[PDB]
């Protein structure tokens, strides 16, 4: 097997990391201080879960992964936690001070003094490796460290590992949840400066998993806790491939062969079917149509965008369950014939199938029922670009006036590197119109 | 030259001073470089036993500066509400304009010295009155949200 | 960011600064001997970001007092938490500055700086991440007004990294009817809109009108006035203060607040209103946005808000709250800039103040502030034309250049607020 590093950067990304490693421990049976009694094979192995878990002499499954934030709250939080033994603690950096919701902050003036201590903290985890693929990369764009702190350890991983891939979780900012006016600065900023070290990047639309919590789960005000078990079902469904035997997406390099055409469109829709209320823990077991049906409704989707509005270029379908692959061939075909989903002159019309015939995990305390059938689809749409279109807007209308715009060049920042990051997403909005919004 | 020493003493309120110079033919009327004379010196530091001794002795009670300022306009500014009572009982004219078009109802008014302003209007103060930028005292407390003000004007 | 290190200068600056540390310290359940006698851990959480621990359980305010005037030490001493404070912390002079802007800040003011600056440093150094400074002082008189802005200035060289927020109280004449306030108040924001990150705008015209009009209270005193200044105080530190959803600090609040650096002075709020001695969530919203409940003598109907931080303290349904809040801003849209998306935001607290059940505090950084500064820039221009009492000014060492500058800037920031209220998106 080949290892994949994962790093989880700002308040966002690290209370994400928290959500999704705790899953990972329930699929995999492992118990908070590390200890496997499935895993024969004491002190190392090349199984699957090796890929995200390395092993000590003494049975302990340490996760490889790396939890960064320039102030200690939220990672204290993971430090004195239900897992605290889990993780390595020299793998758990913390600054003093954070970067005041500023991406000049987080890449130029305070990321720096920490830039050089996270990087040593990588090295070590990946001479442990004998063949590492690459960096699952967790951040908000909105934050001050997850904007600013992200690209400059993009750009530094990109010098060191020149030839290893680079995924991301990225959580795209909503007005609900929010915490700062300057995001939409924030995002432009790191989307610009990370477009081209990024190999393959999933946007999370925090307000389109607010609105999944409160239609589906009833749930009523949508806390950080209540999106970010969500979001973890969706990010561990995505990695499934690389911790579990399959044909789809067994690696890094796979995800970019089969979801990124062309390396600056490097955004895929993911969609997740179903999503029941615990409450209803009797609820009739949906068929294989019903849940490949319910991928293309824009109401599932991890980002709001309506892909009829647009063309595919790939579609991947990932599930997990009680599925035969005869009823998956059977959904797929009234699913071309039937409905409107037109895909690129250029591209094979084709759906990639992979089926994990193991039922999607529950936490205890989670909102969400146990189903026996799940899917994940993954797609490459040009109406992602209505995304970034939003994005934009909301970026232009403050800075016609140049607004807050001093705070970001009092800490390091030239007022050009704004209209630079501003023309290079007008050249990513005319990427999609080129080959088809 | 007690003239400049006249200018000095009603400034610094020094009363028996004051006396002694008039005493020994000091001009009351002597002006300053900028046209002040010891009456609007006395009214603008608030020496009214200064006042009351020169208004005594020939001094003009609407005497300006280069300015246009008479006594008046100075102790309205200022608040000394003493003295404006008592250069309106010598003859001070009520509705006097200095170089900006401001009366001493406007500087009243600006400066929120309340009583003053009720004063000024039992003397006759010209409420129609502009300055050069057309305003009126009415104008002045409706632009600046003084209800107070507006209230004793629209009486 | 954690430790903030509050000055307090001259008669308003100390007789404010004091009744903020007695409601903080009832608020946290902190008694006039430094112990803590509370119900509650959220107390003690963030208690660090104004107090300094000390052996015995003892919690000593990180509080600097200073005055050239001796009697107001004097004053403090004898208030209910006044030996709460460090004695060696009182730096306080033999002359007072007798409301003279250039005593305070040239003669008088500069000759105790230095011993001011080296208890700064004392404080400061002792602290583990500050964050910056607080100042509560008045505009209008001479120490808190001349050595209030000559500290502000000498404290930006030695930390430029750090923030600097200041309390300060403006000048009215149906409070004080002293002529030189305007001078004094004018030289001063000149050097505010240069060396403070963010000021909070007190108002004795508003605190003046609120206490006669709608608490009616005939002849109010400087203890009514007062009794709204603390209580606004203390909802706007509050998420400083307490831990709520967001890890507040100062640097934050002005990133969010202050779109262009000059713009940095906010028209603060507070619901309900109450005398000393003596709601449901739609009319605390309602109130917050009332000219009658806001702190300065402006109107915000006749300007537009640029941000908004709104902040409910009590027990409140928190879907309410964001109901409520969407609501204000439909029906009130056109006095909102456009071009700034997700302009207000919202906190709310578990623990309300003494009395109230209930509370609402708003901080708008609103164009309609003009009108503040429009009404002590034509009462300096009507004293300034006449040239009345500036030889107390000039003998002191100043310059009459000095006068117009201030002047100059006074009006360059009213023009720069109604160039962003005319703005448009389209
Ligand atoms: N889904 C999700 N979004 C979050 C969470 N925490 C913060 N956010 C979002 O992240 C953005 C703010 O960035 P944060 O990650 O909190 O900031 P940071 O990276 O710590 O940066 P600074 O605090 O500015 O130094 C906003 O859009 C929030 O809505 C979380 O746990 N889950
Ligand atoms: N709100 C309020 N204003 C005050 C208080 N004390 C003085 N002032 C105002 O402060 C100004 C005079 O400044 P002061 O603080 O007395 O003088 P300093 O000691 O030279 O700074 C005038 O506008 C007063 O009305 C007070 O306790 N509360
Ligand atoms: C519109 O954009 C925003 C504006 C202000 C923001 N928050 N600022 C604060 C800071 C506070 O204490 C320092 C508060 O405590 C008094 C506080 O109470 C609500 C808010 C955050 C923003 O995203
Ligand atoms: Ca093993
Ligand atoms: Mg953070």
């Known amino acids: 097997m080949r290892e994949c590093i994962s790093i989880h950067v700002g308040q966002a990304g690290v209370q994400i990391g928290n959500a999704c490693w705790e899953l990972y421990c329930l699929e995999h049976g492992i118990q908070p201080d590390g200890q496997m009694p499935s895993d024969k094979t004491i002190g190392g192995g090349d199984d699957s879960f090796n890929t995200f878990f390395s092993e000590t002499g003494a049975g302990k499954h340490v996760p490889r992964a790396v939890f960064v934030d320039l102030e200690p709250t939220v990672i204290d939080e993971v430090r004195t936690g239900t897992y605290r033994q889990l993780f390595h603690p020299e793998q758990l950096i913390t600054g003093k001070e954070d970067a005041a919701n500023n991406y000049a902050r987080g890449h130029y003036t305070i990321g720096k003094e920490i830039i050089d201590l996270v990087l040593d903290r990588i090295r070590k985890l990946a001479d442990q490796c004998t063949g590492l693929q690459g960096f699952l990369v967790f951040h908000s764009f909105g934050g001050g460290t997850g904007s600013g702190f992200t690209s400059l350890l993009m750009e530094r991983l990109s010098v060191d590992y020149g030839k290893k891939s680079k995924l991301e979780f990225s959580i795209y900012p909503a007005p609900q949840v929010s915490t700062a006016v300057v995001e939409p600065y924030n995002s432009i900023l790191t989307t610009h400066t990370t477009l081209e070290h990024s190999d393959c990047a999933f946007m999370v639309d925090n307000e389109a998993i607010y609105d999944i919590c409160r239609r589906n789960l009833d749930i009523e005000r949508p806390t950080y806790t209540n999106l970010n078990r969500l979001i973890s079902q969706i990010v561990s469904s995505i990695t499934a491939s690389l911790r579990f035997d399959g044909a789809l997406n067994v690696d890094l390099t796979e995800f970019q062969t089969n979801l990124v055409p062309y390396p600056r469109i490097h955004f895929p829709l993911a969609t997740y079917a179903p999503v029941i209320s615990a409450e209803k823990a009797y609820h009739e077991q949906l068929s294989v149509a019903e849940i490949t049906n319910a991928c293309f409704e824009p109401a599932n989707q991890m980002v709001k965008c309506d892909p009829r509005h647009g063309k595919y270029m790939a579609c991947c379908l990932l599930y997990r369950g009680d599925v035969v692959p005869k009823d998956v061939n059977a959904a797929i075909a009234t699913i071309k014939t039937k409905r409107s989903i037109q895909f690129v002159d250029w591209c094979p019309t084709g759906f990639k199938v992979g089926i994990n015939y193991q039922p999607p995990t529950v936490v205890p305390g989670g909102d969400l029922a146990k189903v026996q059938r799940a899917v994940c689809m993954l797609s490459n749409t040009t109406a992602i670009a209505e995304a970034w279109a939003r994005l934009d807007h909301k970026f232009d209308l403050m800075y016609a006036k140049r607004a807050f715009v001093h705070w970001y060049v009092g800490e390091g920042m030239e007022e050009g590197e704004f209209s630079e990051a501003r023309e290079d997403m007008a050249a990513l909005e005319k990427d999609y119109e080129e080959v088809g919004v | ?155 | 960011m954690r430790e903030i290190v509050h000055i307090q200068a001259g008669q308003c600056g100390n007789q404010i600064g004091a009744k903020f540390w007695e409601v903080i310290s009832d608020e946290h359940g902190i008694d006039p001997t430094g112990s803590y006698h509370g119900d509650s851990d959220l107390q003690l959480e963030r208690i660090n970001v104004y107090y300094n621990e000390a052996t015995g359980n003892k919690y000593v305010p990180r509080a600097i007092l200073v005055d050239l005037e001796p009697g107001t030490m004097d004053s403090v001493r004898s208030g209910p938490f006044g030996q709460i404070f460090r004695p060696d912390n009182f730096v306080f002079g033999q002359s007072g500055a007798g409301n003279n802007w250039a005593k305070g800040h040239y003669t008088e003011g500069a000759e105790l700086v230095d011993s001011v600056l080296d208890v700064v440093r004392k404080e400061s150094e002792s602290c583990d991440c500050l964050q910056g400074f607080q100042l509560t002082h008045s505009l209008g008189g001479g120490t808190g007004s001349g050595m209030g802005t000559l500290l502000i200035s000498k404290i930006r060289e030695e930390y430029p990294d750090r923030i600097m927020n200041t309390f300060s109280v403006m000048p009215s004449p149906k409070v004080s009817d002293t002529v030189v306030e305007p001078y004094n108040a004018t030289l001063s924001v000149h050097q505010l809109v240069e060396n403070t990150d963010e000021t909070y705008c007190i108002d004795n015209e508003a605190l003046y009108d609120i206490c006669f009009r709608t608490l009616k209270l005939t002849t109010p005193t400087y203890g009514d006035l007062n009794h709204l200044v603390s209580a606004t105080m203390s909802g706007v530190t509050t998420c400083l203060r307490f831990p709520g959803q967001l890890n507040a600090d100062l640097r934050k609040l002005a990133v969010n607040m202050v779109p262009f650096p000059r713009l940095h002075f906010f028209m603060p709020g507070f619901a309900p209103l109450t005398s000393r001695g003596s709601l449901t969530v739609p009319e605390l919203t309602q109130q917050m946005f009332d000219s009658k409940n806001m702190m300065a003598a402006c109107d915000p109907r006749h300007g537009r808000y640029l941000t908004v931080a709104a902040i409910f303290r009590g027990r409140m349904s928190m879907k309410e709250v964001d109901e409520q809040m969407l609501n204000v801003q439909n029906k009130n849209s056109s006095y909102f800039v456009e071009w700034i998306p997700n302009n207000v935001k919202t906190a709310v607290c578990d623990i309300p103040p003494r009395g109230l059940k209930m509370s609402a505090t708003f901080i708008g950084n609103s164009t309609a502030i003009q009108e503040l500064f429009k009404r002590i820039s034509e009462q300096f221009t009507a004293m300034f034309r006449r040239k009345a009492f500036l030889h107390w000014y000039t003998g002191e060492g100043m310059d009459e250049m000095e006068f117009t500058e201030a002047e100059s800037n006074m009006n360059d920031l009213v023009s720069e607020y109604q160039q962003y209220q005319d703005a448009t998106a389209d």
Do not use: C
């Open chain 2, 1 to 155: 030259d007690l003239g400049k020493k006249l200018l000095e003493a009603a400034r610094a309120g020094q009363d028996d001073e004051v006396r002694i110079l008039m005493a020994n033919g000091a001009d009351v009327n002597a002006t300053d470089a900028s046209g002040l004379t010891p009456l609007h010196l006395a009214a603008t530091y608030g020496h009214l036993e200064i006042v009351e001794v020169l208004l005594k002795h020939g001094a003009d009670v609407n005497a300006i500066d280069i300015m246009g300022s008479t006594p008046l306009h100075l102790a309205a500014l200022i608040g000394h509400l003493e003295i404006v009572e008592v250069l309106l009982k010598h003859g001070a004219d009520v509705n006097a304009v200095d170089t900006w078009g401001d009366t001493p109802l406007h500087l009243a008014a600006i400066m929120g010295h309340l009583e003053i302003v009720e004063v000024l209007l039992k003397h006759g103060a010209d409420v129609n009155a502009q300055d050069k930028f057309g305003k009126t005292a009415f104008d002045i407390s409706i632009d600046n949200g003084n209800e107070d003000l507006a209230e004793i004007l629209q009486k």
